[PDB]
Design a protein around this ligand. Structure first.
Ligand code: SF4
Ligand code: SF4
Ligand code: F3S
Ligand SMILES: [Mg+2]
Lengths: 534, 267
């Protein structure tokens, strides 16, 4: 019958970094999958022996998509190792830059990385812009007119008629494709908003630079707090607040309504891409030394048992190498980590990736927006509960819909909406604290000769941790365990498929030469291979 | 993907963190939509292109072999150790990919310190043998214009492309092959804290009242005096730059800065 045989997708585009996905398909459905990360840099090797204060500048260059997040994780890690308790204002400013990062990151992911799996941009040219404008105005309080959308259509028409399709060259939707479902008018609205998002994200990123010097790769964190005395001024706070407000409006008025319209059209995608286990670290602390003080709390769930959320024990993480291109087969806790590259080529000695395979109590764990949202929901988080219930009700689906590619994509929008609102709460608290006369942003500290430290960040892709062993006041060991490592790393020495590999089993493939269904699931995890491998 | 009227750009990703690609998305006046729809034809770019896998490979071959010619923009260092094995795309080493494609380009721009000078993965002990593009490909005659920084100011990329399209040639380049129109001044000579430097008014710590008052960050490690870039002039995101945020320059537009400029908090 249908296709039986291998499919390889190399490069996987519209991700960060260098990913090769291999699947075996039987009768048009995926029966096996391998997640192969094909670039190694070795930042952990490079850090050895250096000044712990330098680590955040190197590790920030783990990734420029999730920029700032590694600087924050390393600074939390060295703050922890030195035993410094940073001032309240440093926590606020660090938290505000992080909230801005999530909004930038998720908006770009949905439009610029994910949406071409679901939107036929060329079909937008046949749409009726008056009909499209009525649809757009019914899903958003933002009023869109026929002329608004005709402007987009005319621009796209001129682009396509030049024959230079640029980033749309060889798109899987060109010519039509059976797994693309949208009508012309919905394709035109999504395309209009893709283009709009290209300029809105400039403002979303600018918000990070107001306090954080620049985007990408911020430069305002130090051990002990932050450096940006200008961030205390009413002028910088007003500039941030105006950019945040505009970004939140876009989230609420453009991204979430689009996400819901697309999800409604692709409701069969509730049936693919599910996973069993979830881990999240919590984010936006009131207390840098207490994860349970975070607005989102840490937690662990096995086999979708959300009635029995397990506390997160940081000692139950081990990183496997048996199916990775490193020496040997021994899993290691990151305070005893090892990064000893040894390449065997694809499936040589059963090894096929430069990512290690993190396991929690021996199990493969999804992390990222779906873990953060589901675990916060199950902890009774009122804001997460209110918008996930509203999203479920709009879509007319039950909560089991969330254990899927569609649900993961929706969770990314839910977390964006919730964080966009919480950034305003954080901003008010920050303003309040300045008004009490607290203008301190950095605290003094001393470097110990020997210490261990760990820093935890829940980044846009999930639980990030940096682990340091200080020896003679220098980096004796520095290990990064990154969200995409959890999600997209390979099998472990118990041969358990990782979340992305397992989630791919059962994927239908209508056309093996244009396997957009594989990209829909892989992209729903928002892979970052520079992150996962470092 | 191309042919006609807009100049073709092939954008390659080697050993990189994608911060340089992100920096281009921050392009301002012109913005990135103007750049991709009006100015240029972006014919290959793994971060945002629609095609994947074989379809993406075919898009790349069509662009590189075009009789109309293409410009290459390259992000990331080339890993050369172990015969290039540490970095592959479509199961080809990055070294082989770049060796085959870049000699066919009408012009090559190395964008970001990794592509220009080797960058973060080339820092000691350089396990993957990462090299900048011109070092890696010297023997093939490749001479990329180097636009340095980690990441660079995207103003400097668009300014170099526009110059090239107008004048059919590279602008004046310094001895590191960087355009002098952007890299001809130290960041220090342009810095607002220079009067404090001259007066020997240095912040002794980040928590100090001197730091609050905006005194010079040289004692806290600032590499402004040895770094060529236009940061204080152009700023980033139309609003800020490191020492206006209170933090020293870490020298990120300079070759080997990860080893030359460290420890970052010492001078
Ligand atoms: S130059 Fe810096 S920002 Fe650009 S790819 Fe390299 S590490 Fe990333
Ligand atoms: S802060 Fe840095 S760039 Fe500015 S005057 Fe001092 S040493 Fe120079
Ligand atoms: S760190 Fe880099 S961004 Fe400019 S201020 Fe120094 S050259
Ligand atoms: Mg690691």
């Amino acid at each position: 019958s249908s296709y039986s045989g291998p499919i390889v997708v190399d490069p996987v585009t519209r991700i960060e970094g260098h990913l090769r996905i291999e699947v075996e398909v039987e009768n048009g459905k995926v029966k096996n999958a391998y997640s192969s990360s094909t670039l190694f840099r070795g930042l952990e090797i490079i850090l050895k022996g250096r000044d712990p204060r330098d680590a955040q500048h190197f590790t920030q260059r783990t990734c420029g998509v999730c920029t700032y997040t590694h600087a924050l994780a390393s600074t939390r890690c060295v703050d922890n190792a030195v035993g410094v308790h940073i001032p309240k204002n440093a926590t606020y400013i660090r938290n505000l830059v992080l909230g801005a990062q999530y909004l930038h990151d998720h908006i770009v992911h949905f439009y610029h990385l994910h949406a071409l799996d679901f939107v036929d941009v060329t079909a937008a040219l046949k749409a009726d812009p008056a009909k499209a404008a009525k649809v757009a105005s019914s899903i958003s309080p933002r009023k869109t007119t026929a002329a608004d959308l005709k402007a987009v259509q005319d621009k796209l028409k001129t682009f396509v008629e030049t024959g230079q399709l640029g980033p749309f060259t060889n798109a899987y939707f060109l010519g039509g494709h059976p797994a693309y479902y949208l009508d012309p008018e919905t394709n035109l609205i999504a395309t209009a908003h893709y283009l709009e998002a290209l300029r809105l994200q400039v403002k979303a990123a600018r918000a990070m630079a107001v306090f954080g010097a620049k985007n990408p790769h911020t430069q305002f964190t130090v051990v002990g707090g932050v450096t940006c005395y200008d961030a205390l001024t009413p002028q910088r706070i007003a500039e941030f607040e105006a950019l945040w407000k505009e970004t939140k409006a876009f989230v609420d008025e453009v991204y979430i309504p689009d996400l819901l319209v697309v999800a409604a059209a692709y409701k069969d995608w509730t049936q693919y891409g599910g996973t069993d286990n979830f881990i999240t670290f919590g984010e936006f602390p009131k207390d840098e030394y207490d994860l349970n003080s975070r607005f989102f709390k840490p937690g662990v769930v096995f086999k979708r048992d959300f009635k029995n959320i397990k506390p997160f024990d940081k000692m139950q993480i081990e990183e496997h190498v048996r199916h990775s291109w490193y020496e040997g087969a021994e899993a290691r806790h990151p305070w005893k980590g090892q990064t000893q590259p040894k390449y065997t080529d694809l499936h040589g000695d059963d090894r096929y990736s430069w990512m290690k395979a993190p396991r929690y109590m021996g199990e493969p764990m999804e992390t990222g927006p779906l873990a953060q949202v589901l675990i916060a929901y199950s902890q009774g988080h009122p804001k997460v509960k209110a918008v996930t219930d509203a999203v479920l009700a709009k879509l007319g689906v039950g909560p089991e819909a969330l254990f899927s590619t569609l649900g993961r994509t929706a969770a990314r929008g839910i977390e964006t909406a919730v964080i966009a609102e919480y950034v305003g709460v954080m901003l008010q608290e920050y303003k309040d604290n300045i008004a009490k006369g607290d203008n301190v942003i950095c605290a003094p500290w001393e470097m110990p000769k020997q210490a261990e430290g760990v820093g935890f960040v829940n980044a846009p892709r999930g639980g990030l941790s940096h682990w340091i062993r200080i020896e003679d006041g220098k980096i004796g060991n520095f290990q990064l365990v990154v969200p995409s490592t959890w999600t997209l790393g390979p099998r472990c020495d118990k041969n358990k498929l990782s979340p992305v590999e397992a989630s791919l089993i059962g994927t239908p493939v209508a056309d093996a030469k244009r396997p957009v269904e594989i990209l829909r699931t892989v992209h729903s995890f928002d892979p970052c291979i520079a992150c996962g491998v470092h | 993907l191309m042919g006609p009227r807009r100049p073709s750009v092939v954008y390659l990703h080697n050993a990189e963190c994608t911060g340089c690609s992100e920096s281009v998305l921050r392009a301002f006046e012109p913005y990135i939509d103007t750049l991709i729809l009006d100015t240029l034809s972006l014919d290959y770019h793994e971060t945002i292109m629609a095609a994947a896998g074989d379809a993406a490979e075919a898009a790349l071959e069509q662009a590189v072999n075009s009789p109309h010619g293409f410009i290459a923009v390259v992000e990331g260092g080339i890993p050369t150790a172990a015969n290039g094995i540490y970095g592959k795309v479509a199961n080809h080493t990055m070294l082989d990919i770049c060796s085959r494609i870049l000699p066919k380009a009408q012009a090559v721009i190395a964008y970001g310190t990794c592509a220009t000078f080797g960058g973060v993965q080339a820092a000691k002990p350089n396990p993957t043998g990462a090299k900048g593009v011109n070092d890696a490909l010297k023997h093939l005659g490749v001479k990329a214009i180097n636009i340095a920084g980690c990441p660079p100011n995207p103003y400097n990329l668009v300014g170099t492309i526009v110059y090239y399209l107008k004048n059919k040639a590279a602008p004046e380049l310094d001895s590191l092959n960087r355009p002098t129109m952007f890299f001809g001044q130290t960041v220090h000579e342009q810095c607002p804290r220079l009067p404090h430097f001259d007066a020997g008014e240095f912040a002794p710590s980040f928590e100090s009242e001197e730091a609050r008052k905006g005194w010079c960050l040289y004692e806290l490690g600032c590499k402004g005096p040895v770094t060529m870039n236009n940061c204080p002039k152009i700023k980033f995101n139309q609003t800020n730059w490191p020492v206006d945020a209170g933090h020293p320059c870490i020298g990120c537009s300079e070759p080997d800065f990860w080893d030359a400029m460290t420890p970052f908090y010492q001078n």
